[PDB]
């Protein structure tokens, strides 16, 4: 369950937050495939309750009402078409699995659902699954309010209701079997793995129970007994009863310590210096690399009050954002996930964005298609960070240096740093307020390389900065602190 199952050589996945199935299918063929992306993490493909107040927030999709593959992203055959078309071009699909809960206990009764299924939250009624009141924990919780009141007690965070969400009784075989049925159908459709949403709120044992019921991957694209990729969402920044190391037995885990620590470093807050990133990795208190799923930001914390507060960098902070994403991508620690989001009107009142609920680009609830401009950027308010040359080329960079050891670290004692990945790639950063001028050993074979951050190798030419490494592997680097993108990168396949 630890292996990503991506096509050999592909080392990252992108979160196409709220994209429609028809757009992802196309995106797979027109771009993800050609650009070496390993796979896509899609938003919950199961039916959820419809929220009109606020008007269709993104989070309504974390309130399941059934497991019918029917949502604002698309129907089941659209979903199927997408999995077939992405796999056929070497791009895996990973489903966001919301299995710890159904919708909010205080929702109205009726069919106000993405697929018209009926449900009565008040009575724990979900005929379309079907689930009854005895399929929920209600009695098992011991807090007075029935909700989570203290994260210092593992029992209530796993047996009580997260923000009113009807907590599913995952200890019951009936429940585990029903969830496995949903995930297995997905597997049979072609899905390569899952993100286990809100793992923190479930017992590791119940997870295991469900996981062990899962089928092997679809032999149409994978070899025989291939196990699905499992990466559990556990927000562990320390200071709590629950720790991520408790779920290592089920698969990998989201290391939120990563994005928090890196954001601070790159932002140069609290006296942090990039030169301190020499021992980046487990050394910094992080979980074991082969258990980590890393990212700079996620759909949740990029909205601020998530895991990491304002230290988390996002596309709003473009310049610095690209440097962090680039450092993570060049560095060997963990398995990387890049974020691809959508724009919305932020409105911070007393330190909190009260518009952070706003859902994906839409025309009266109907999600907008993702339009591609000739310059390869996206339209209709989709940010498409996964298409910024700076990030796109670094995903290629990671693919190219795969398996190569961290090497040739250099730093100017302040905020200028650089390192290599064996003899296949080198990267330099200038995060100081002054010019960077140095002759560094790149570990790369002599030659002329295209800087993949300022340009691209097209035909027999570079569109941007050219770096010349002499026979002895050294090269002169010059980056003004005022450069558009204060870091250069070159690799085996960017060599002219």
């Amino acid at each position, epitope marked *: 369950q630890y292996a990503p199952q991506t096509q050999s050589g592909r080392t990252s996945i992108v979160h196409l937050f709220e994209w429609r199935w028809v757009d992802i299918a196309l995106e797979c063929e027109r771009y993800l495939g050609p650009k070496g992306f390993g796979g896509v993490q899609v938003s919950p493909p199961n039916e959820n309750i419809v929220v009109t107040n606020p008007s269709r927030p993104w989070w309504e999709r974390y309130q399941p009402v059934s497991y019918k593959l029917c949502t604002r992203s698309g129907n089941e055959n659209e979903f199927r078409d997408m999995v077939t078309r992405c796999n056929n071009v070497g791009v895996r699909i990973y489903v966001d699995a919301v299995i710890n809960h159904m919708c909010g206990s205080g929702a109205a009764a009726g069919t106000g659902t993405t697929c018209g299924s009926y449900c009565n939250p008040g009575s724990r009624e979900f005929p379309a699954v079907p689930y009854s009141a005895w399929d929920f924990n209600d009695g098992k919780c011991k807090t007075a309010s029935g909700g989570i009141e203290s994260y210092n007690d593992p029992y209530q965070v796993r047996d009580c209701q997260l923000v009113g969400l009807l907590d599913l009784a995952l200890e019951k075989d009936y429940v585990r079997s029903m969830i496995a049925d949903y995930l297995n159908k997905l597997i049979d459709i072609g899905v390569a793995g899952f993100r286990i949403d809100a793992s923190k709120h479930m017992w590791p044992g119940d997870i295991k129970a469900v996981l062990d019921k899962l089928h092997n991957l679809n032999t149409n694209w994978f070899p025989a007994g291939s196990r699905p990729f499992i990466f559990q969402e556990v927000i562990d920044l320390g200071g709590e009863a629950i720790k991520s190391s408790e779920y290592f037995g089920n698969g990998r885990v989201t290391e939120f310590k990563y994005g*928090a620590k890196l954001g601070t470093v790159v932002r140069k*807050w609290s006296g942090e210096k990039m030169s301190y990133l020499k021992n980046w990795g487990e050394g910094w208190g992080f979980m074991p690399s082969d258990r980590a799923l890393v990212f700079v930001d996620n759909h949740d914390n990029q909205r601020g009050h998530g895991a990491g507060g304002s230290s988390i960098l996002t596309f709003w902070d473009a310049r610095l954002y690209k440097i962090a994403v680039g450092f993570m991508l060049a560095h060997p620690y963990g398995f990387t996930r890049v974020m691809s989001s959508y724009r919305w009107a932020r409105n911070f009142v007393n330190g909190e964005d009260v518009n952070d609920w706003i859902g994906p680009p839409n025309n009266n609830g109907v999600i907008k298609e993702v339009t591609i401009n000739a310059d390869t950027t996206c339209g209709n308010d989709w940010v498409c960070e996964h298409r910024w040359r700076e990030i796109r080329n670094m995903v290629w960079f990671r693919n190219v240096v795969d398996g190569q050891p961290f090497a040739n670290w250099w730093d100017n004692g302040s905020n200028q740093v650089a390192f290599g990945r064996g003899n296949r790639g080198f990267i330099v950063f200038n995060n100081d307020d002054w010019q960077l001028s140095s002759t560094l050993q790149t570990g790369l074979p002599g030659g002329t390389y295209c800087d993949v951050i300022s340009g691209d190798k097209v035909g027999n030419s570079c569109t941007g900065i050219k770096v010349y490494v002499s026979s002895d592997g050294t090269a002169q680097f010059s980056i003004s602190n005022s450069a558009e993108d204060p870091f250069i990168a070159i690799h085996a396949e960017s060599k002219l």
Partner: nanobody
Amino acid sequence: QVQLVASGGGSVQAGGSLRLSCAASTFSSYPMGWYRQAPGKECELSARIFSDGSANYADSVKGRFTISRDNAANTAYLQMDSLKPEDTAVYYCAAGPGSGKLVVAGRTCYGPNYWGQGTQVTV
């Protein structure tokens, strides 16, 4: 419940020395550091010691301060030699896995999760 109690501190003349101590009742297998907050100034990381023993040092203290741990008593240490009046500020002991924050004087310090009450140093 973890509690980080810092010791040492006080006033001293320029060029003098001070040794700060931090006790913890949390073990010591993750990074522990020392931050300092001067009046009206941003919070700054002074020195950090990683599990393996390697350390980070603010360029302005490098060669003048020496961070260390004991393990045999769960105590971290920060020896401050050749003190300078610029070193005047409140020093906070900081430790733990993951990350946390310290909200002081309207400013927040992103760091190690657990902080100490802060000891006053004056040069």
